[PDB]
Design a protein around this ligand. Structure first.
Ligand SMILES: CCCCCCCCCCCCCCCCCC(=O)O[C@H](COC(=O)CCCCCCCCCCCCCCC)COP(=O)(O)OCC[N+](C)(C)C
Ligand SMILES: CCCCCCCCCCCCCCCCCC(=O)O[C@H](COC(=O)CCCCCCCCCCCCCCC)COP(=O)(O)OCC[N+](C)(C)C
Ligand SMILES: Cc1cccc(O)c1O
Ligand SMILES: Cc1cccc(O)c1O
Ligand SMILES: [Fe+3]
Ligand SMILES: [Fe+3]
Lengths: 256, 256
């Protein structure tokens, strides 16, 4: 993991970042025992392997809001800590891999097209999709799930179209028996994310987009702990006589 | 380590602390690769056991500046990460324990009196003193030093007086082959603290004071990496015909 930040730019950032915290401490009269609690918790965050968790929930949304300033395509959202590269490729119309359990849940049928800024369809286009199962678990972040449960790389057809069938995701609770959940518990917050799909959408010559989609009227949609929900990314699926939820969303990519 | 911070107070703090960082990220256009570097470094800080180091150098000075608002006695300073409780008690006039190496260094003779706000001397008074040796090492933070090298608990006499002989401390470099020094290296900073003594001064019925003392004209005194030097805490020892450095400083305690 590298950047090419200059010492001068790190110096300006660190100074107002340290200035920032130091000013909060001064504003609220943080005490020595509060300080000691804060020191222990930071240690616990690392010992709990929760730096990705904590930072993706509480910080990454500002880093996406930066990127969002230079992009004219589909709204992005945070990646979160559960992306895995190289999920198995599937054809343009496919079902995501799932367990027999998973089949008991309302299907979600997700259609659309990857296009450029003018609205031309894109051949070569990929949709990387991943989301939690109805129990709030992600494959590879839970020993009982097949390694690619509800994960996959959809190859859009020559026109950049896809029809991907999955399960309707459910509200997901972040892990809470660790320093991150203890942090939310101690301030009477809640550890919930709205139900959501995660997606990385790509095409030759295009800048990839990392995004999420949520579901209209879904719970926690206006109080996501990760502060990652945007109005533009809320789908409103219609249910068909077959009892499957159906939705169309297209992705629009900026030039790389 | 506990506090009795209310959820509401944690909520107000965390909100402007997160607001703070999130605003820095927005101000400087922090990028995804910068974000990834920052995530790794945080992990490395924990894996390097450097949370006490990092926070005592870059944050604790604001927490002392809070405490400083309610105290009328001697100026405090940060504790730093190297305090050890229960250092062996010594009499009111004593030498701090040291190695044969240590004896090659100019002695420092440190005199004074612990008093209250009105200037009455204090019986029962203790000075806990600790500092680095001429090599920049602290006992118990370096496998080659005796466990109480340059550490001790001086019992002030019935009038609250002490005459403590030690070595003249030297500028201390913080550890730099870790994530904290890498953080300072990457911004073209320097990892130096001015030469200094650490002290906890106590008396029955008094609120203890944690402080540090520095040496007039000493290097890094105006650019301490820990931002912990105060003008009030700079001593100006005089050297005697015996070639020992001599200095008088008294401590004034607030009521507990
Ligand atoms: C760069 C990433 C870091 C960004 C900083 C984000 C803000 C962090 C502030 C949250 C500190 C986490 C403290 C919550 C843990 C408390 C639960 C706990 O186990 O302690 C308990 C008791 O502690 C409590 O219940 C009260 C917790 C709140 C006191 C901590 C307030 C810390 C504020 C100082 C941070 C200011 C930073 C600027 C120990 O008993 P067991
Ligand atoms: C609550 C405590 C935390 C408070 C936050 C304080 C500010 C933290 C910002 C400093 C991040 C530390 C990055 C320095 C490590 C870089 C050296 C390194 O190994 O990376 C190198 C390359 O990285 C570099 O050389 C450039 C480093 C600067 C880029 C990081 C900037 C981070 C800014 C984001 C933080 C904003 C927070 C608000 C990997 O090659 P090996
Ligand atoms: C942003 C985010 C944070 C934690 C867990 C998740 O599933 C997620 O999407
Ligand atoms: C404040 C501080 C931080 C790091 C090392 C020290 O010796 C010290 O006094
Ligand atoms: Fe998620
Ligand atoms: Fe020190």
């Amino acid at each position: 993991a590298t950047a090419d930040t200059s010492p001068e730019r790190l110096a300006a950032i660190a100074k107002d970042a340290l200035g920032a915290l130091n000013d909060v401490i001064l504003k609220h009269g943080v005490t020595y025992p509060e300080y000691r609690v804060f020191k222990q918790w930071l240690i616990d965050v690392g010992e709990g392997g929760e730096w990705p968790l904590f930072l993706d929930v509480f910080i990454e949304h500002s880093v996406e809001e930066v990127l969002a300033r230079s992009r004219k395509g589909t709204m992005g959202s945070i990646e979160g800590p559960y992306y895995i590269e190289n999920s198995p490729e599937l054809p343009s119309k496919c079902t995501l891999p799932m367990r027999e359990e998973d089949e008991k849940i309302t299907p979600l049928v997700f259609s659309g097209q990857v296009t450029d800024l003018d609205g031309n369809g894109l051949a070569g286009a990929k949709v990387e999709l991943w989301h939690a199962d109805n129990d709030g678990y992600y494959s590879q972040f839970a020993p009982h799930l097949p390694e690619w449960n509800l994960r996959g790389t959809i190859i859009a057809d020559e026109e950049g179209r896809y029809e991907i069938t999955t399960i309707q995701p459910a509200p997901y609770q972040i892990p809470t028996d660790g320093p991150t959940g203890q942090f939310i518990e101690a301030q009477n917050g809640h550890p919930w994310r709205p139900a959501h799909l995660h997606l990385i959408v790509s095409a030759p010559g295009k800048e990839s987009v990392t995004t999420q989609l949520y579901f209209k009227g879904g719970e926690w949609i206006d109080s996501d702990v990760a502060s990652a929900t945007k109005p533009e990314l809320i789908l409103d699926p219609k249910t068909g006589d077959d009892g499957k939820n159906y939705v169309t969303y297209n992705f629009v990519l900026d030039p790389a």
